Design a protein that fits this description.
The complex is a heterotetramer, with one copy of chain A, two copies of chain B and one copy of chain C. Chain A is of the alpha+beta class. Chain A is built from 33 helices and eleven strands. In chain A, the strands form two sheets. A six-stranded antiparallel sheet of chain A has the order 8-7-6-11-10-9, with helices on both faces. By secondary structure, chain B is low in regular secondary structure. Helices cover 13% and strands 0% of the residues of chain B. The longest helix of chain B has 9 residues, at 57-65. Chain B is rod-shaped, with a radius of gyration of 37 Å. Chain C folds into three domains: 16-18 and 21-227, GAF domain (Beta-Lactamase), CATH 3.30.450; 230-436, 2-Layer Sandwich (Beta-Lactamase), CATH 3.30.450.40; 458-814, Catalytic domain of cyclic nucleotide phosphodiesterase 4b2b. Chain C has a six-stranded antiparallel sheet with strand order 8-7-6-11-10-9, sandwiched between helices. A five-stranded antiparallel sheet of chain C has the order 2-1-5-4-3, sandwiched between helices. The longest helix of chain C has 44 residues, at 201-244. The chains are: A alpha+beta, B little secondary structure, C alpha+beta. Chains A and D meet through α9, α10 and β8 of A and loops of D. The structure holds cyclic guanosine monophosphate (2 copies), 3-isobutyl-1-methylxanthine (2 copies), magnesium ion (MG) (2 copies) and zinc ion (2 copies). The site of one cyclic guanosine monophosphate (PCG) has 17 residues of chain A, from β1, α6, α7 and β5. It is classed as signaling protein/inhibitor. Keywords: phosphodiesterase, GPCR effector enzyme, signaling protein, inhibitor, SIGNALING PROTEIN-INHIBITOR complex. The assembly is tetrameric.
Chain lengths: 824, 69, 827, 69
């Protein structure tokens, strides 16, 4: 009997090793095997070896083509089931969510004869298993192979699959597939038909035979991780590119960043909601609640203490046709807000992962078709968006991964990185708002400054009495009428002798100086050539006069004196030969506004006191401020005397003004001083004056150097005045210096220099003599040598030096005869 | 067909209770920037302007007396 | 015995095989898959039968362990293929790409039938690098196919450089590429078939069949390398993003912070960063000497942007030994990183440079000696530029001596390119930092000029505080008593001018007299002595308030003084002070005096419609918040601070009261909170005696604030309760201002003004005035009359004014009616 | 010694005209972005208007007549 043969074989180990360990004839092994084995095989061992080697080679060839994973592991599971004489095997795939581990199913009830259709499980049929329930959880958590002799005696065993699948288990054997120190999957064999329990040989075969499925799963896991990391890197790079494009508000930045990376997320829909950031309410909004007219707020509150209020929601529909929608005021029944998950996320600040949203109890869902397209929510993942101050500014929620699988650890890491990067970028929005507010404040301050400096309607009537003579406002007057009015009021060319080197303003009022300033412009002839409006000219002169502060020395009188000295240098000194009319226009205009807003202190005091002037401007603190203020006044339409000028002429005038105003700095004059000497020396040998005038009229750089030198000479012109005018101005500068020294002593608590203290007020003649010897003499001697018409300046300078020296010797004799004679 | 696991509709699990959620990632990536060595030299200065060019020491002293320095 | 059993087994050999594979297959599978040193006769060359084929197949399968050392496994496969293919030597040429030009270096060389790993492994310094278009190796790289060369002489693309170098002769070649699916990963080769003319087709079949095992090993190696590189790139980017957004800082500190943290993810011994100077154009005094001929023009390298190449700061990161970080301002040309000349070349061209075997390079000048005592010597470098959003090079970053002793490859280039791309984008933050600093400084400068133009100087203060005449000292030297005597001498009498009455008129008085009356008002509240207010500061503050008001048709200093006088009269004559304290009353008056300090003559609607900067800044209540801000600015000045002798709590309470008062002047805000004041008034009538009501109100802050707002609103509109003579002129002033704003609206903008503003309808003023009286003022005045009996004069005055305005409007309407029927309709 | 018989360094059968890679400026590079859908109604758009919600259109029109609104 066949059963008799089988039993006699199995209960007789002595004979079994003998007959099967026999040299079998080649034709016998040829007939025994199906089809025909090659000549190599001669025994059962060789036949089994050849067959198994061929099967393993075919399996390797299958893995070679691409990443199949499922098919290869199914075939090796069938082979292992045949080898082990079991009847069931399964594949449980490791997955991590919310920081906890799970063991889903990927292959179930694989039998020695089966097809991939009846063992593969769709994502909607997996039996998830926590890391505590069941033997599989123990295997996953202990990272060790587990053999169970009897299931009924196993403490950590779960029967959950038995009722569902209607099966009874009597033996279990499992092992974790590892990719280093992380579990990838577990493979389990159930209900050993071979015998009562798993023998040691079956354990050894199970351990050895699985070194190939481990390789396949390792390849699959490595490919998945590489793809995920590449996608995360691309997302971060694109977000960084979009964030740094410009400075905008939070909403624009968030929308750009979220829209640009819509292809790297692989999601059906995702919505972004923005939370209000109002910390406190105003008095007129808290009054009704405190008076019992309205009920106090009672609802969810963020951990910062604010009120959850989504004031804007942006939707991204991607499954069908792209439809980006922005909701101004999100209704309470919005398809995203109605779940209640974003509100809970805002209250807590937790990353929430949902596997089966319809079968949920904490948050309610629609549990049906959201839209006519029949898109049903199946997987949700929500994260907060916090800045560097740990304040939630929004909530991002993602739905329905495209591939049809629940959100795993990699997706959580990717989207958390995206939201983390977007949270830090809020610092750009704060800087944007702060910049806008600063700009608005500066513009307001500039307007308030402009109102006070400008000349109003009533003030202009002191110079343009059109309200009575014409009975009309100056704006509506005609050019001819304005000129006729101006002719009478304006002083005559020789009334105030504005052409001389000895002009004194001590006998004229401020209005007289303004009228003389207008008369200089009329004398230069630029009024009729450039079509300068006369009302604009008068208003500009009055505004410039008002711009100067009411300080001791650097008041409007100093500016007018410098302008008049430049005018007489151009006209009386015959330095106009080298310059055109536009250059003279710009020169006079720059001379008027060279000390427009002097505060009464020099540059060094600005540097030492950390004034904002010393911070905004680095090299020439005050001299750059005056130019900026003067150009600010000229930018106004009503005060722009450059209204009718070509673009090239305007740029030329602006460049000349920039050169002239900054040139008044004494340090720059000291540095670039020998170039003027070289130019003078070149002039002295060229030829008669006509050829030199012809040549120098074309050299731009030499003309600019002479321009700067004339600026410097005009700035210090107060010394080349007659001794009556001198010795009176010299007291004003001393008073200003003494005031600055007092400010230095009280505020900065530093001892002033011997020039800048009231105690050494008897050494003024010596200091004046030293200043004359050091600074003025070089420039005035060089200008006298250049043009012989400027000799009176040098003569008066030498006379003033003689007078100051005589005073110094008198003081020295007095102090000598006191100290070294009276005491001794 | 009845499927391998005999389960339809959605994933089943033998775990009941309130779900747990991850806290955040707010420690691994978190005076500003002062512990970095070599940090002292870096920083914009307010003395990047040349005081004066090649001048005699007596003239340099004289410039200070007149506040032009 | 089982003789009948063995006969039965012979009868059905299938059953015997079944029994054997049930009870014995597991043992043979366990033994074969375990260490068994497969026995194949390798002594001679012979054909392989099924048993030996199975043995060699189970080998190369025993090696599929967890460690999976690629080199050892591929070496074993090659050693077996040596016997299988009947070849003499084999080698492995790895595939790498540098500078976009792929190379083919060697890793395994000269493996024969009986060889060992140490004698065939190739160190990184012994590689034979081959271009991709020189030999048959390059041909198989390009064609991506197996190539068989029966004779080397007939081959056109065969190179004998290795043959001469290795004193070897090749007559046969057969190669095949190992691919990851679309990109080659390595090339295997055979040479000099033993005991044969050339490699046959069977050798090709054997090589193709046994190449399967090496493909998986190459795949796992490549996948692991790529995954590691991508993870490193992601970490680098995220760390850099974390460190950039910490705060706003200049480029140097930001770059140092970004580059210090990612030092671990960059597998380099050294790396340094140099910073270029971004100055584009000099100034006139710097171009004068060059043009005049005092200094030779600059001659040297220039960036493509058109600037001189100057490195003003270089940061060195040394990591091979002890971690040192140094910064060298104005580095000399002798610097170790700059002496090579590669940074200057990169700055000139803006190209990514990858250099292998740097010492043996002729284009540049690299040091060929140990740079330090440890013997660290430059072998491989990589330098790339940093480019901002305007395609301008900002700096150059260089990297040296990869840690694993291998030349830089494509992955390193991509990683560092992503890092430098991120760094170049982040330059926006330092630019915004500098712009912010400049804007803040510019704002601070302009605000001082307003302070000077509004503050009362020492010359104007002598018009009231005549200290320079009664004494010889300036007000600073004088003590408080002398100032008090001078003020009491100068200030006008209170009852003579009727400063606490509801009919006070400012028409005869002058503005200086109004300032003196304001000082007298402050004195009359007994507030100066209580809080130790400096009298000089009080006078200067009042004069500054007088000067700060614009010379507008209506909203002059006179209007502010009228509002302040009305508030004082309400506090004193109206007996509304019983609730508030002295400090609250002081805040009342001070906020009343500065409610429209800087009015421009236009309402909030014009500010919103014309997009004024005030509308952009404030938004909700433009002019009220502007006035509050400007008024608080003046009080913050030391010379104009009357709150200086106040503790923190008192000062905070005063400031809060001021903000409550000034904003409350808004008409919409008053319109939205009338019913609450009505409810307070109604509640006031449920108490028996006035004393109880005063006691209750003194402890209710919100109702006091509501009364604050309502009294401010009543004082703002107080000009409509004056006798007929004053109203007849104030109405015309207000109408003139409104007409001016309307004609401004018609010109600058393109909307017709409302009938309340257009100048043509100048004869409908009585109708608008009576409508305004019926709509707005009557409610507040009636409520205040109900609240306190002493406010009735205002109610009777306003009702008389309404009667007169109604009479005028009726006369005008009758005139228009008559002029339109007898003259236009019936004729 | 070595299988490749060279110890000094890598050897190649070529010459020394060094070639270097150009920077990539096509993938990422080539207000700023307005073609994005939904970008039009997403700015600051400061148009905060008090709803009032307590005044009928008679008194609302009367209030707007006097310019207080
Ligand atoms: N019907 C069926 N159940 C299985 C199979 N494999 C494992 N199980 C069962 O799934 C269960 C999961 O928890 P356990 O590991 O404790 O015990 C296991 C087994 O009882 C299989 O192949 N078919
Ligand atoms: N000595 C030796 N030379 C080899 C080996 N493999 C390839 N080569 C030689 O190196 C060369 C690489 O490109 P070739 O086209 O010149 O052909 C090859 C052969 O000439 C090897 O294993 N040993
Ligand atoms: C005050 C300073 C600009 C230089 N400066 C000057 O210009 N004048 C006219 C002086 O008399 C004078 N005395 C000292 N410094 C002087
Ligand atoms: C708008 C504001 C001027 C309020 N206001 C006012 O105070 N007075 C006195 C008026 O006559 C008037 N007429 C309209 N609005 C007016
Ligand atoms: Mg000056
Ligand atoms: Mg107002
Ligand atoms: Zn000057
Ligand atoms: Zn007012």
């Amino acid at each position: 009997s066949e059963g008799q043969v089988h039993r006699f074989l199995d209960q007789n180990p002595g004979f079994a090793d003998q007959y099967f360990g026999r040299k079998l004839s080649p034709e016998d092994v040829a007939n025994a095997c199906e089809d025909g084995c090659p000549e190599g095989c001669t025994s059962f061992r060789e036949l089994c070896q050849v067959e198994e080697s061929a099967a393993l080679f075919e399996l390797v060839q299958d893995m070679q083509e691409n990443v199949n994973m499922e098919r290869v592991v199914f075939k090796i599971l069938r082979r292992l089931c045949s080898i082990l004489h079991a009847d069931r095997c399964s594949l449980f795939m490791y997955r991590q969510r919310n920081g906890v581990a799970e063991l889903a199913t990927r292959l179930f009830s694989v039998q020695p004869d089966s097809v991939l259709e009846d063992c593969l499980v769709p994502p909607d049929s997996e039996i998830v298993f926590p890391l505590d329930i069941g033997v599989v959880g123990h295997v996953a958590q202990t990272k060790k192979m587990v053999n169970v002799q009897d299931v009924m005696e196993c403490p950590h065993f779960s029967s959950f699959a038995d009722e569902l699948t209607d099966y009874v288990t009597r033996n279990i054997l499992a092992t974790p597939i590892m990719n280093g120190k992380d579990v990838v999957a577990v493979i389990m064999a159930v209900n050993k038909l071979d015998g009562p329990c798993f023998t040691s040989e079956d354990e050894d075969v199970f351990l050895k035979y699985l070194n190939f499925g481990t390789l396949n799963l390792k390849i699959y896991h490595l490919s998945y991780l590489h793809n995920c990391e590449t996608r995360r890197g691309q997302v971060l790079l694109w977000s960084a590119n979009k964030v740094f494009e410009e400075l905008t508000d939070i909403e624009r930045q968030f929308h750009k960043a979220f829209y640009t990376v819509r292809a790297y997320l692989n999601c059906d829909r995702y919505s972004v909601g923005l939370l209000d950031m109002t910390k406190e309410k105003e008095f007129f909004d808290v009054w009704p609640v405190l008076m019992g007219e309205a009920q106090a707020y009672s609802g969810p509150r963020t951990p910062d203490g604010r009120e959850i209020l989504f004031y804007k929601v942006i939707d991204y529909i991607l499954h069908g046709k792209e439809d980006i929608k922005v909701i101004p005021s999100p209704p309470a029944d919005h398809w995203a807000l109605a779940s209640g998950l974003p509100t809970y996320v805002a209250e807590s600040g937790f990353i929430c992962n949902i596997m089966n949203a319809p079968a949920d109890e904490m948050f309610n869902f629609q549990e049906g078709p959201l839209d006519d397209s029949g898109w049903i929510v199946k997987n949700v993942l929500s994260m907060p968006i916090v800045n560097k101050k740990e304040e939630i500014v929004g909530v991002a929620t993602f739905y329905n991964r495209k591939d049809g699988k629940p959100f795993d650890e990699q997706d959580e890491v990717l989207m958390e990185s995206l939201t983390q990067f977007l949270g830090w970028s809020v610092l750009n929005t704060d800087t944007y708002d702060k910049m806008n507010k600063l700009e608005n404040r500066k513009d307001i301050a500039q307007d308030m400054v402009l109102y006070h400096v400008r000349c109003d309607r009533e003030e202009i009537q002191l110079i343009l009495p059109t309200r009575e003579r014409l009975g009309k406002e100056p704006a509506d007057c005609e050019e001819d009428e304005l000129g006729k009015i101006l002719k009478e009021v304006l002083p005559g060319p020789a009334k105030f002798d504005i052409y001389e080197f000895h002009f004194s303003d001590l006998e004229c009022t401020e209005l007289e100086l303004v009228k003389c300033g207008i008369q200089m412009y009329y004398e230069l002839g630029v009024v009729r050539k450039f079509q300068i409006p006369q009302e604009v000219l008068v208003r500009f002169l009055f505004s410039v006069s008002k711009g100067y502060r009411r300080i001791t020395y650097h008041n409007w009188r100093h500016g007018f004196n410098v302008a008049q000295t430049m005018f007489t240098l151009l006209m009386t000194g015959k330095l106009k030969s080298y310059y055109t009319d536009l250059e003279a226009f710009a020169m006079v205009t720059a001379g008027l506004c060279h000390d427009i807003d002097h505060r009464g202190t020099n540059n060094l005091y600005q540097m030492k006191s950390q004034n904002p002037l010393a911070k905004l401007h680095g090299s020439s603190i005050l001299e750059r401020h005056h130019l900026e203020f003067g150009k600010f006044l000229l930018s106004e339409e009503t005060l722009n005397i450059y209204q009718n000028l070509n673009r090239r002429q305007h740029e030329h005038v602006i460049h000349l003004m920039d050169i002239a105003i900054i040139a008044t700095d004494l340090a720059l004059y000291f540095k670039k001083r020998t170039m003027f000497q070289k130019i003078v020396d070149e002039s002295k040998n060229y030829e008669d004056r006509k050829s030199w005038v012809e040549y120098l009229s074309l050299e731009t750089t030499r003309k600019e150097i002479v321009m700067a030198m004339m600026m410097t000479a005009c700035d210090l012109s107060a010394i080349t005045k007659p001794w009556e005018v001198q010795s009176k101005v010299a007291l004003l500068v001393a008073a200003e210096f003494w005031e600055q020294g007092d400010l230095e002593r009280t505020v900065l608590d530093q001892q002033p220099i011997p020039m800048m203290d009231r105690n050494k007020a008897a050494e003024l003649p010596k200091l004046q003599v030293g200043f004359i010897d050091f600074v003025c003499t070089f420039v005035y001697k060089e200008f006298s040598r250049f043009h012989e018409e400027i000799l009176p300046m040098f003569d008066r300078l030498q006379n003033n030096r003689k007078e100051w020296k005589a005073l110094a010797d008198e003081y020295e004799a007095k102090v000598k005869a006191l100290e070294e004679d009276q005491k001794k | 067909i009845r499927s391998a696991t005999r389960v339809m509709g959605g994933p089943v699990t033998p775990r009941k209770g309130p779900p747990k959620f991850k806290q955040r990632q707010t420690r691994q990536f978190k005076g500003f920037g002062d512990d970095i060595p070599g940090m002292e030299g870096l920083g914009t200065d307010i003395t990047v302007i040349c005081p004066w060019e090649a001048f005699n020491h007596l003239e340099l002293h004289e410039l200070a007396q007149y506040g032009i320095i | 015995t089982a003789e009948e059993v063995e006969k039965f087994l012979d009868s059905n050999v299938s059953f015997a095989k079944q029994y054997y594979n049930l009870r014995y297959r597991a043992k043979v599978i366990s033994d074969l898959l375990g260490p068994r040193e497969a026995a194949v006769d390798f002594s001679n060359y012979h054909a392989l039968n099924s048993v030996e084929e199975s043995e060699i197949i189970f080998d190369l399968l025993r090696d599929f362990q967890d460690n999976l050392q690629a080199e050892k496994c591929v070496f074993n496969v090659m050693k077996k293929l040596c016997f299988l293919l009947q070849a003499d030597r084999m080698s492995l040429f790895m595939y790498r790409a540098r500078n976009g030009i792929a190379e083919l270096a060697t890793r395994l060389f000269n493996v024969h039938k009986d060889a060992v790993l140490e004698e065939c492994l190739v160190a990184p310094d012994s590689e034979i690098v081959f271009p991709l278009d020189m030999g048959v190796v390059g041909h198989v790289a390009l064609s991506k196919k197996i190539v068989n060369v029966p004779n080397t002489e007939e081959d056109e693309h065969f190179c004998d450089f290795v043959d001469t170098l290795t004193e070897y002769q090749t007559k046969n070649i057969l190669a095949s590429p190992i691919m990851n699916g679309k990109d080659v990963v390595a090339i295997i080769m055979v040479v000099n078939k033993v005991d044969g003319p050339h490699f046959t087709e069977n050798d090709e079949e054997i090589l193709l069949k046994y190449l399967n095992f090496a493909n998986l090993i190459m795949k796992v190696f490549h996948l692991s390398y790529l995954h590691n590189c991508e993870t490193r790139r992601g970490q680098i980017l995220l760390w850099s993003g974390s460190k950039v957004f910490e705060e706003l800082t200049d480029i140097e500190r930001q770059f140092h912070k970004a580059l210090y943290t990612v030092r671990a993810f960059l597998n380099c011994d050294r790396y340094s960063v140099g910073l270029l100077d971004m100055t584009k154009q000099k100034e006139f005094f710097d171009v004068w000497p060059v043009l005049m001929g005092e200094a030779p023009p600059y001659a040297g390298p220039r960036t493509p942007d058109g600037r001189e190449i100057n490195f003003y700061k270089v940061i060195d990161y040394i990591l091979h030994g002890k971690e040192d970080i140094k910064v060298i301002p104005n580095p000399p040309p002798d610097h170790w990183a700059l002496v090579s000349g590669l940074p200057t070349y990169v700055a000139q061209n803006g190209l990514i440079c990858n250099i292998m075997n740097a010492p043996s390079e002729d284009f540049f000048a690299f040091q060929k000696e140990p740079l330090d005592e440890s013997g660290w010597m430059i072998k491989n470098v990589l330098s790339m530029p940093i480019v901002n959003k305007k395609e301008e090079i900002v700096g150059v970053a260089t990297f040296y001596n990869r840690k694993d002793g291998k030349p830089f490859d494509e992955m390193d280039e991509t990683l560092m390119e992503s890092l430098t791309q991120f760094l170049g984008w982040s330059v926006l933050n330092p630019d915004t930092y500098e712009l912010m600093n400049k804007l803040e400084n510019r704002k601070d400068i302009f605000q001082d000029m307003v302070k000077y133009h509004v503050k009362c100087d020492n010359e104007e203060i002598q018009t009231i505080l005549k200290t320079r005449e009664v004494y010889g000292k300036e007000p600073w030297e004088c003590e408080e008593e002398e100032l008090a005597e001078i003020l009491q001498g100068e200030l006008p009498d209170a009852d003579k001018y009727e400063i606490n009455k509801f009919h006070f008129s400012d028409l005869p008085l002058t503005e200086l007299e109004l300032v003196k009356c304001g000082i007298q008002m402050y004195y009359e509240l007994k507030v100066v002595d209580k809080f130790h207010i400096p009298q000089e500061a009080l006078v200067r503050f009042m004069y500054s308030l007088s000067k700060g008001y614009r010379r507008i048709t209506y909203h002059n200093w006179r209007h502010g003084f009228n509002v302040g006088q009305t508030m004082f009269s309400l506090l004193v004559t109206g007996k509304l002070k019983r609730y508030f304290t002295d400090l609250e009353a002081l805040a009342m008056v001070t906020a009343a005096f500065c409610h429209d300090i800087d009015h421009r003559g236009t309402n909030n609607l014009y500010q919103m419609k014309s997009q004024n900067p005030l509308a952009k800044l404030h938004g909700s209540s433009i002019l009220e918040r502007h006035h509050l801000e400007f008024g608080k600015t003046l009080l913050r000045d030391e010379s104009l601070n009357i709150f200086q002798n106040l503790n923190r709590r008192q000062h905070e309470h005063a400031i809060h009261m001021m903000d409550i008062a000034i904003i409350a002047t808004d008409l919409a805000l008053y319109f939205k909170k009338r019913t609450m004041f009505q409810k307070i008034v109604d509640q006031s009538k449920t108490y028996e005696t006035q004393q109880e009501w005063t006691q209750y109100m003194m402890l209710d802050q919100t109702r006091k604030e509501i009364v604050m707002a309502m009294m401010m609103t009543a004082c703002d509109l107080s000009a409509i309760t004056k006798p007929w003579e004053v109203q007849s002129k104030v109405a015309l002033l207000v109408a003139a201002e409104f007409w001016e704003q309307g004609d401004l609206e018609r010109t600058v903008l393109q909307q017709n003004p409302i009938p309340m503003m257009d100048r043509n309808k100048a004869d409908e003023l009585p109708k608008l005035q009576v409508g305004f009286i019926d709509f707005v003022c009557t409610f507040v005045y009636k409520e205040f009359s109900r609240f306190h009996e002493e406010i009735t004069p205002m109610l009777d005055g306003i009702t008389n004014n309404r009667k007169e305005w109604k009479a005028l409007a009726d006369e005008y309407e009758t005139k228009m009616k008559g002029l339109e029927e007898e003259k236009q309709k019936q004729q």
